[PDB]
Design a protein around this nucleic acid. Structure first.
Ligand code: ZN
Lengths: 50, 115, 59, 121
RNA sequence: GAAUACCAGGUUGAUAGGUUAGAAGUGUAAGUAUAGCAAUAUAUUAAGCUGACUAAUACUAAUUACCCGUAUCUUUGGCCA
RNA sequence: UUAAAGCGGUACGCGAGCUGGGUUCAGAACGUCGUGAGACAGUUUGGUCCCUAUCUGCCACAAGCGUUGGAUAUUUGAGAG
RNA sequence: GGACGCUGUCUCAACGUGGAGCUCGGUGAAAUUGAAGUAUCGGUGAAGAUGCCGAUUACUUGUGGUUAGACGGAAAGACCC
RNA sequence: UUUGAUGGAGGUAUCAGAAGUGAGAAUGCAGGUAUGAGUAACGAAAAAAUGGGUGAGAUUCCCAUUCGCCGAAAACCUAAGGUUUCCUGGGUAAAGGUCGUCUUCCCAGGGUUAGUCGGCCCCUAAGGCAAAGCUGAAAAGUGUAGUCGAUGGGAAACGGGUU
RNA sequence: CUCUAGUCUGUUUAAAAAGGCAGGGAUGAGCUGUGAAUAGGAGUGAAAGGCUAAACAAACUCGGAGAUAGCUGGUUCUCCC
RNA sequence: UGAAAUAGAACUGAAACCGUAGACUUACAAGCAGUCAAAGCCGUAAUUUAUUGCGGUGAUGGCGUGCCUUUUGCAUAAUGA
RNA sequence: UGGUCAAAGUAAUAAGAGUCUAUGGUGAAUGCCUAGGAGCUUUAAGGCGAAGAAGGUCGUGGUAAGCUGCGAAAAGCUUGGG
């Protein structure tokens, strides 16, 4: 059964990448929150996939 | 009670005590020759583990008591306790998972000079 | 199809002791080497059986 | 209750049982002595003794029958030339199956099958 | 006959297997020969082959084998002494 | 047709035995009522029947043990179907 | 809804084949679980008794089957309020 | 509160004060271990068998001979993805639904060579951003000139051999 | 290559929606790869109260929030009157 | 070696759980597993010594519907472990 | 009186299970301790960055896996004081 996570890469980087996060207000809030919490991974761009 | 000069102990052996105890019952109190023959014959994992421990116990007794041969020795006592457990996962339908315990046993054998 | 009450240790012990019971194999000392071998089987230690070689026992 | 006496079915469907018997008989004739499960060897000897008694007399027609079961040419020739001429006289019982004990691991009953008299070399 | 148990037998034995033979199934094999261009037919041929059964036959396998296993004692009656 | 085609109880016997036709979901249509949303033991069609048996109970086969010396056979019979 | 043909759907079941089930060896769960040296019948009772009264039956302990019960397990009933 | 075993380093009378001050249950929480139970399964009805070698240890490793299965594939070559899983050597705590000398397991070492391939690049589809202009409490929303955006369009290679 | 009437296995399954048999479409209201656009009182819907990351009569995450409950459950050592 | 190796990848190491050995009891019996009586066996102290106590097991007799929560009222087959 | 026999009581078995006594295994509760925390007081400091911040990637070790430090001059360098 084709299911929930057909894994593209251009979709991954475009929709959830660091530049897509910085591109708007809420994404920058996301980045600040994750920095404050001290996450080891900020965005999907830490998975080097292009 | 133990003459710990004459004994062997095997800790964390890869079998379940529930499966090793019957084989121990069949050789408790027998002569060494008869017990060794039984353990060699019977094709059970517990049988092989007991064979190693019993042979080691007899070896220790012989080494510390040079005038004791293979045919004055009888298996005086035999104890089989339970040892560490490891849990691994067996996945089933509908996302249900079950934990699948693996048991080990301790084995203690003491031999003694026959009547 | 599920146990209604946990059984007593007596019942569990009884069932376990009766079922998990293995029987000794019969024996008969080899005519050649004197080992105690399973009756009606080739000797595993010397290979003979009724004074006939059948195996070639290695290590 | 059980009907169909004469087999052990060797725990496998008919075609695979026939193939099993053919291969083990071939190997038995090739090697003069083999080890296997007691049931398998029992059926093997039931058929091997039959083949030997059929091959006691060497003719074209008999050879062409024995080919319907022995598909190794070398071993068919060996059976007709080297094996039977030593059992020309024996009224039966050319083989000998002797038990070996319970095998470690799955506790099968092993046994050894061999010829009573080794053939010509 | 589920593992059981019972029963039969264990070299002093036909218990099983093999083998021989028969009750029987298939219904005329392979090879060769004749006739036909060939297909095919006929003779060899109640053939060949298969024989879950039955009757024999120690040829092969059940070993020069291992564990369990008998009037406790008291009182009374009868017989014997 | 048969000599005769009885009346009741047992969770209107019996779904951890089976069947889902009906009853009693979400579809749709018809009749009627309500302004309408909808309602109607009015009608028609479609519409998952889960669970490896612990104990008791029952159908069968064994192990251990007793039956007062210990065993091997033949049987009288309570009782039961 | 009816007709023709065809059939193990049925009277009526039997046999055979394959995967499980059965025994042994290795590995090894689950839900449930106050425990248990837990018999039945007639009665009583939070009004359907394994636990009470009376009575009856029953050497001790397993295994393979089948679910009659333990108002079985699973889902703080979906129906009613 | 007294005597022992175990234990090897801090407790505590009297009086007075203060509480996270006393668990048997909440389909309680956390951890360990019974129970069912050595019972159901051990994952498709494509099928294995013999001999030999390695090894302490082989029905399950390796090699050889037969048999069986797929064969508009269960074959081969490239994407989408995975990221050392690839090769050589060594080893079996765990893990592999069993065993294991074996493995996509572990450890060490080694391994990916481009002018002609695929990208990068020069172009644009849908689309996104977008000075200016215009519109809105803010944050922005619309939107022109432009600029980005391939599954598209554009220069160049084939055969054979080697580890 | 795409779909699922009917039936069966499965339903503490191999699969949190398959598989074994079969059926419809099969040059078109066609299937499908690779990108992009529509986000929650909104979107989308050849229209069934469907779908929108396995759950939709108003998605999910965080915060208000320890929301409010005439409802249910639980509430731990002792003695005397 | 160390004060210690039932200090050897870990201090003190209980309960739940799994065992071994010894003593006693049990295979004619219907036990909320307890209490009140009680023969015999075993351990032990006194009394000159086999009858009284501290003890552990216990044939047999009498009595006895687990607990919690909730209800006019529960062993209840109401609830919860 | 001994033996045989008849009769009435009784001892001698535990495949297994139940209860004590002596012993262990499994398990990590209790006791004890702290390598890390929590709640505040008294001072000081309350910004950083286009002279490129905060926060990260990559790389730097005789040899490192991670962390930290550091920035191809890369677990450091120069000057001054201690
Ligand atoms: Zn020998």
């Amino acid at each position: 059964m084709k299911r929930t996570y057909q894994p593209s890469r251009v979709k991954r980087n475009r929709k959830f990448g660091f530049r897509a996060r910085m591109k708007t207000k809420g994404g920058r809030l996301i980045l600040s929150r994750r920095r404050a919490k001290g996450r080891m991974k900020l965005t999907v761009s830490d998975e080097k996939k292009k | 009670l133990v003459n710990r000069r004459y004994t062997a102990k095997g800790k964390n052996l890869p079998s379940s005590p529930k499966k090793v105890r019957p084989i121990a019952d069949n050789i408790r109190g027998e002569s060494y020759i008869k017990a060794i023959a039984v353990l060699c014959s019977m094709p059970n994992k517990g049988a092989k583990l007991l064979e190693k421990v019993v042979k080691s116990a007899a070896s220790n007794a012989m080494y510390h008591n040079k005038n004791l041969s293979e045919d004055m020795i009888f298996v005086k006592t035999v104890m089989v306790d339970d040892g560490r457990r490891r849990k691994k996962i067996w996945p089933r339908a509908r996302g249900r998972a079950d934990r699948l315990v693996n048991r080990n046993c301790h084995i203690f054998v003491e031999v003694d000079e026959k009547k | 199809a599920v146990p209604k009450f946990k059984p007593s240790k007596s019942r569990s012990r009884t069932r376990r002791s009766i079922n998990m019971r293995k029987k000794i194999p019969q024996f008969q000392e080899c005519s050649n080497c004197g080992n105690l071998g399973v009756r009606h089987r080739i000797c595993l230690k010397c290979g003979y059986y009724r004074n006939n070689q059948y195996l070639e026992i290695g290590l | 209750m059980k009907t169909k006496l004469g087999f052990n079915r060797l725990s496998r469907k008919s075609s695979h049982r026939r193939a099993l018997l053919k291969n083990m008989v071939i190997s038995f004739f090739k090697h003069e002595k083999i080890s296997s499960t007691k049931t398998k060897l029992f059926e093997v000897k039931r058929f091997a003794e039959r083949l030997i008694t059929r091959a006691k007399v060497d003719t074209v027609h008999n050879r062409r029958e024995l080919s319907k079961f022995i598909h190794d040419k070398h071993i068919l020739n060996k059976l007709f030339t080297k094996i039977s001429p030593v059992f020309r006289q024996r009224s039966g019982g050319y083989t000998r199956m002797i038990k070996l004990g319970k095998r470690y691991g799955d506790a099968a009953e092993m046994a050894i099958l061999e010829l009573v008299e080794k053939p010509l070399k």
